[PDB]
């Protein structure tokens, strides 16, 4: 049954605290820390990790994780497990742990590519690889009617054969729809999808320069969208811009738009 299902997703998805060894602070994150990780797996030898730390409260978080774990596409972050700590002052500690990326997010690397150090200039070819990367893990969120509601490159993981997968699921990034009457949907993931694949073709840019936060329901109200990058194609921007749409049922499906996307990928000479 459906519960017999979410009881066996439960089991799998804790980790003994004794198979885990933290490390150094990686960062702060929203909730707070992410740390650096060893997890002792089955077959005796130990995996580098992430490790982010943060009844009813502690139960959701278990239902959730325990639905995330279940996950399983290249172009989705896998949750490894997780964790309930307690604090001194009897405060839970839900741990969440995830596969380490040495290359870190993607925004980051976008950004770093325009520095001398950092990795080289991105070709386009590898921009629109990432665009891709992004549309089949949303594609296989989306056939799963799961909703991701914070995409954007700075949420877009990199790994080691340079993969782009979407992992933690900031108003410039927000639907009109949802902005006006708090309703989200799966076009409201598309609608972020079109930022994020603006911020791949900027390099890491902040979008609507000019604009104020408190300004940006009214700049769209008025139909203004975000300008078609320098050296854009307009194939990708018209697939951007078909993302912004004011009407959600106008906008492409992930599906729609990755098959736009790899077409256009394939073209490239
Ligand atoms: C350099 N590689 C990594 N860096 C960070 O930094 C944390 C991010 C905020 C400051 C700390 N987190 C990583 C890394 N690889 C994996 N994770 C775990 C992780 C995600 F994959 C996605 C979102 C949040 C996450 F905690």
Same mark, same amino acid.
């Given at each position: 049954?459906?519960?017999?299902? $979410?009881?066996?997703?439960?089991?799998?998805?804790?980790?003994?605290?004794? *198979? $885990?060894?933290?490390? &150094?602070?990686?960062?702060?994150?929203?909730?707070?820390?992410?740390?650096?990780?060893?997890?002792?797996?089955?077959?005796?030898?130990? $995996?580098?990790?992430?490790? /982010?730390?943060?009844?009813?409260? !502690?139960?959701?978080?278990?239902?959730?994780? %325990?639905?995330? /774990?279940?996950?399983?596409?290249?172009?989705? !972050?896998? *949750?490894?497990?997780?964790? !309930?700590?307690?604090?001194?002052?009897?405060?839970?500690?839900?741990?969440?742990?995830?596969?380490?990326?040495?290359?870190?997010?993607?925004?980051?690397?976008?950004?770093?590519?325009?520095?001398?150090?950092?990795?080289?200039?991105?070709? *386009?070819?590898?921009?629109? #690889?990432?665009?891709?990367?992004?549309?089949?893990?949303?594609? =296989?969120?989306?056939? #799963?009617?799961?909703?991701?509601?914070?995409?954007?490159?700075?949420?877009?993981?990199?790994?080691?054969?340079?993969?782009?997968?979407? %992992?933690?699921?900031?108003?410039?990034?927000?639907?009109?729809?949802?902005?006006?009457? &708090?309703?989200?949907?799966? /076009?409201?993931?598309?609608?972020?999808?079109?930022?994020?694949?603006?911020?791949?073709?900027? &390099?890491?840019?902040?979008?609507?320069?000019?604009?104020?936060?408190?300004?940006?329901?009214? =700049?769209?109200?008025?139909?203004?969208?975000? /300008?078609?990058?320098?050296?854009?194609?307009?194939?990708?921007?018209?697939?951007?811009?078909?993302?912004? &749409?004011?009407? +959600?049922?106008?906008?492409?499906?992930?599906?729609?738009?990755? *098959?736009?996307?790899? #077409?256009?990928?394939?073209?490239? +000479?």
């Amino acid at each position: 049954s459906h519960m017999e299902e $979410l009881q066996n997703k439960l089991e799998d998805v804790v980790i003994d605290r004794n *198979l $885990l060894i933290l490390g &150094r602070i990686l960062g702060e994150g929203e909730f707070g820390s992410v740390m650096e990780g060893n997890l002792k797996q089955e077959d005796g030898t130990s $995996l580098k990790v992430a490790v /982010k730390t943060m009844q009813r409260e !502690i139960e959701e978080f278990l239902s959730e994780a %325990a639905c995330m /774990k279940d996950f399983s596409h290249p172009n989705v !972050i896998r *949750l490894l497990g997780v964790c !309930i700590e307690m604090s001194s002052q009897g405060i839970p500690k839900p741990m969440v742990i995830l596969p380490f990326m040495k290359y870190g997010d993607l925004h980051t690397y976008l950004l770093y590519s325009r520095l001398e150090t950092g990795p080289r200039h991105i070709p *386009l070819q590898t921009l629109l #690889r990432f665009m891709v990367d992004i549309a089949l893990g949303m594609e =296989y969120l989306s056939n #799963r009617n799961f909703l991701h509601r914070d995409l954007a490159a700075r949420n877009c993981m990199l790994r080691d054969d340079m993969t782009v997968c979407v %992992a933690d699921f900031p108003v410039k990034w927000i639907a009109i729809e949802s902005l006006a009457d &708090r309703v989200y949907t799966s /076009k409201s993931d598309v609608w972020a999808f079109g930022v994020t694949m603006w911020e791949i073709a900027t &390099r890491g840019m902040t979008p609507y320069p000019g604009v104020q936060n408190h300004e940006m329901y009214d =700049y769209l109200l008025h139909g203004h969208r975000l /300008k078609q990058p320098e050296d854009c194609l307009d194939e990708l921007y018209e697939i951007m811009y078909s993302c912004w &749409r004011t009407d +959600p049922l106008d906008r492409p499906t992930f599906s729609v738009l990755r *098959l736009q996307l790899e #077409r256009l990928l394939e073209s490239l +000479p």
